[PDB]
Design a protein around this nucleic acid. Structure first.
Lengths: 259, 70, 117, 66, 104, 88
RNA sequence: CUUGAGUCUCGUAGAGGGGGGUAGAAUUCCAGGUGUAGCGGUGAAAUGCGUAGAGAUCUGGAGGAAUACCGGUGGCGAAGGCGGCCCCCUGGACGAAGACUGACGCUCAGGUGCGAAAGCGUGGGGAGCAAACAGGAUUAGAUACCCUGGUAGUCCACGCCGUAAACGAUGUCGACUUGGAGGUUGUGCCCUUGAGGCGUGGCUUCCGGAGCUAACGCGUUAAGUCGACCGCCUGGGGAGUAC
């Protein structure tokens, strides 16, 4: 009756769009596809590579629950955008928690400055940093035991572009993209960027606040023409890329990957 | 496409940068289009036909993609 | 003749023939060479190889001016655009600027009619 | 991803040269709306502003000319 | 009557004269009960391209609510005056009084 | 086009209520004043065909209005055409 | 009487029209500098221009025409058509609410106007392009295609011409009938918590359902279902010709 109408609004009330409500129960595993059901129109064709943790083997059997992501519906049949992105929100919450007490305390091990700043990795993911943040002072972890264990103390974050730089050592110590597009510019600032779609001439890695990069086809590897990008890297993966070139005018930042 | 060789920059790299700049400008294409005169009708026809081709490529092939080849 | 350290190379690159002209920075030409003059005719002078050797010839010509630095201006569409500048480089000058100097009208004069072939 | 909509400007100013310089080419060209993602309504007026600047020698018509 | 937006440019060698001309202009506008909402001496400024062979020039911006007749008079003055190399009288909808982005 | 103040005026004179603005006679007048205004323009600009097309349309519409008035109420039409000076 | 039709109020976007200014690039020519033997052109040539200094290159000047980028199955216009900025005069369209008029409407034989390009007349102008023409090629021939030149014209003013595959090959006006994906331009609400969310109007591109269709296809912008008015067709040629 209005039973059903009340239920419809109830079920509205007890779900949300993003990957927030850990609801999808893993109802079939086979390699290389995991599948869930989060109260959506269809079941998600999940990769296995969203769900192996830090050493390469699976961690969740049948019945286990992780939320995924939404706001994109039915490319022709199916439902979702993947769940690790959901994990990105949890990582963002942990990073924000710092604000409360002005200190987020984890493990942070930064061996080398990709784009000027040491790379700091939190449990599964690894993020890239600006130079100063790796070290509180000129200490320079190159003389520290390789991949050492301290923490991360935040020096700098870009706040729209997920670039976060953190201070590994020294426990005692405690429109918009295109006007000032000179930050990752100079010649060779490398970046950690997720690829989006490979257009058979390109890969379209683009992460840094609403920009677009192309590592198109020529570099990508150390073979030129017989390469077919889909075979050689991935879909949806954070990689080594750097700028190599910027247009601020015709908005074509032409990244590379042969580096 | 004005360019200046940076200090301790290789020549070949500089040439490559220049070529890229030219490509961006579309100078060669510009020249090609202005070699002789195109009738307005012809210009219109080309533009329209190109758009039609683009639309075909966007939609019909997508539809085809839905179905598997083998 | 007065020696000059820095000067220009103007590269007039046509479809049919390339023309290299070295000049001082003010505008006064020092020497020049051509693919047609390098002994290239018809099919042969409309080629990158023809253009590079024309560039080489021009470089040889202005030896007595003892030019070291050079900026280049590339005009027109042709094969002798990249090849020419490479040849110039090889000839052993410090290339300073590479500029593209094609005359693009902002829709001025009517071009001649399309060929029927 | 248009800037003007987000800012909510009533009209583009040819005087605000820096804003303009973002939308012009290194060679001086006006940048397409495909690349900038500017809204059509906003693109036209932007072009108008650029040209007014060019008349006023605030912006150059092209990189080469002198 | 109608809100015009004038920007005129003076030859740099005549920069010291610039105030008087401005005053003169202003006076005319006042004569016909025309208001003058904003007025910005921009000063000497590098040109994006050299007009009439010179590379710098003196910019003056000017905002007027005035009758068309005086505007026409001003235009004629400008065209005959050799000091001002360029001018741009340009209509506007409102009195815009807040001033310009780079004066800021 | 006609200036707002002039519209308001013409409405005031010919309209009975001065808020009406839609009264046939008022309308006729508005058209007539516009036609008069455009006469000088077109004396200047003889090739301005596009604008003249409007002018002609306005005339035709005025004309239709006059005819309507005639059939409805003859006297009022007479008074209108004495006020405006329309030969017919 | 107010639903159709129209007026008034405030805005909106626009290559809509007419007039008058102006900007930059590029071509051409002139004058001068530097400089030296080629340039140019094609499939390949040759005619042609060049040592009386061309081509290239730099400086200065003249003049005409058109407005790169923006720029878009974007916009405006009855159609033809309209594209650099500025100003002056000017027509239409749309939306928002209200207020008014009160059927004032639709269509239209004759009639009247507008009407690409070419063309004509008189007077101006003339950079580039280019019917005609000339030369060089090609060819069996080449009164063509290609090359080198090149005059009417293209440009402006005022007249005439009144035609085009002037095409959506689809008369105008009104009503009704499943959908999707867009574009553009308004506008109402919504925490704009963000580029968004939910509507509601105008114009517009593509796909497609019922139905229609000889099929192709059209398909809420009909070529569907109906009404009003007009225009037009009656085998091919002869002929849109003769008188």
């Amino acid at each position: 009756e209005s039973f059903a109408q009340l239920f419809e609004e109830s079920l509205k009330e007890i779900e949300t769009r993003p990957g927030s409500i850990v609801r999808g129960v893993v109802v079939a595993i086979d390699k290389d596809v995991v599948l869930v059901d989060a109260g959506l129109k269809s079941e998600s064709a999940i990769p296995a590579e969203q769900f192996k943790n830090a050493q390469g083997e699976l961690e969740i059997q049948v019945g286990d629950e992780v939320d995924v992501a939404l706001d994109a519906v039915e490319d022709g049949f199916g439902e979702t955008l993947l769940s690790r992105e959901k994990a990105k929100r949890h990582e963002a919450w942990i990073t924000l928690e710092k604000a409360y007490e002005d200190a987020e305390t984890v493990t942070g091990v930064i061996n080398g400055k990709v784009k000027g700043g040491f790379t700091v990795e939190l449990n599964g993911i690894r993020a890239f940093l600006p130079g100063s943040l790796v070290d509180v002072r000129p200490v320079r972890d190159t003389l520290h035991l390789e991949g050492k264990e301290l923490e991360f103390k935040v020096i700098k974050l870009d706040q729209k572009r997920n670039n976060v730089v953190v201070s590994r050592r020294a426990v005692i110590e405690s429109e918009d993209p295109w006007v000032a597009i000179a930050k990752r510019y100079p010649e060779g600032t490398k970046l950690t960027g997720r690829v989006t779609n490979l257009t058979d001439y390109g890969c379209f890695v683009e992460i840094e606040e609403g920009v677009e990069g192309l590592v198109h086809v020529s570099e990508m590897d150390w073979t030129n023409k017989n390469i077919h990008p889909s075979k050689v890297v991935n879909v949806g993966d954070v990689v080594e890329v750097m700028v190599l070139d910027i247009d601020e005018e015709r908005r074509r930042i032409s990244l590379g990957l042969k580096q | 496409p004005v360019i200046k060789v940076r200090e301790n920059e290789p020549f070949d790299v500089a040439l490559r940068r220049f070529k890229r700049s030219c490509e961006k400008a579309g100078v060669l294409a510009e020249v090609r289009r202005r070699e002789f005169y195109e009738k307005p009708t012809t210009e219109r026809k080309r533009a329209k036909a190109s758009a039609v081709k683009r639309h075909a490529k966007k939609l019909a092939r997508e539809n085809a993609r839905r179905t598997r080849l083998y | 003749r007065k020696q000059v350290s820095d000067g220009v190379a103007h590269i007039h690159a046509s479809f049919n023939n390339t023309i290299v002209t070295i000049t001082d920075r003010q505008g006064n030409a020092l020497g020049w060479a051509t693919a047609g003059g390098s002994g290239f005719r018809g099919s042969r002078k409309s080629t990158p190889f023809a253009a590079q050797v024309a560039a080489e010839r021009c470089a040889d010509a202005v030896k007595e001016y003892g030019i070291k630095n050079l900026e280049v201006m590339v005009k027109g569409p042709g094969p002798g655009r990249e090849s020419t500048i490479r040849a110039l480089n090889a000839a052993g000058f410090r290339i300073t600027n590479i500029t593209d100097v094609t005359p693009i009208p902002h829709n001025g004069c009517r071009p001649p009619k399309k060929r029927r072939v | 991803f248009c800037r003007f909509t987000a800012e909510g400007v009533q009209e583009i100013d040819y005087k605000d040269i820096a804003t303009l310089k973002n939308y012009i080419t290194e060679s001086g060209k006006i940048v397409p709306s495909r690349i900038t993602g500017t809204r059509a309504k906003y693109q036209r007026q932007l072009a108008r502003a650029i040209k007014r600047a060019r008349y006023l020698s605030l912006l150059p018509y092209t990189d080469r000319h002198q | 009557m109608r809100h015009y937006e004038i920007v005129f440019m003076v030859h740099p060698d005549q920069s010291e004269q610039v105030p008087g001309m401005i005053e003169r202009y202003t006076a005319a506008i006042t004569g016909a009960e025309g208001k003058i909402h904003r007025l910005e001496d921009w000063g000497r400024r590098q040109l994006a391209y050299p007009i009439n062979k010179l590379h710098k020039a003196h910019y003056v911006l000017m905002n007027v609510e005035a009758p068309q007749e005086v505007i026409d008079e001003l235009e004629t003055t400008f065209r005959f005056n050799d000091a001002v190399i360029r001018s741009m009288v340009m209509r506007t909808k409102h009195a815009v009084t807040e001033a310009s982005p780079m004066v800021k | 086009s006609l200036s707002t103040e002039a519209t308001a005026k013409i409405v005031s004179e010919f309209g009975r209520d001065a808020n009406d603005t839609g009264s046939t006679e008022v309308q006729v007048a508005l058209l007539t004043a516009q036609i008069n205004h455009l006469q000088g323009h077109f004396a200047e600009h003889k090739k301005d065909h596009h604008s003249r097309r409007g002018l002609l349309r306005m005339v035709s519409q005025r004309r239709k209005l006059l005819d309507y008035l005639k059939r409805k109420d003859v006297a009022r039409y007479t008074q209108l055409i004495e006020r405006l000076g329309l030969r017919r």
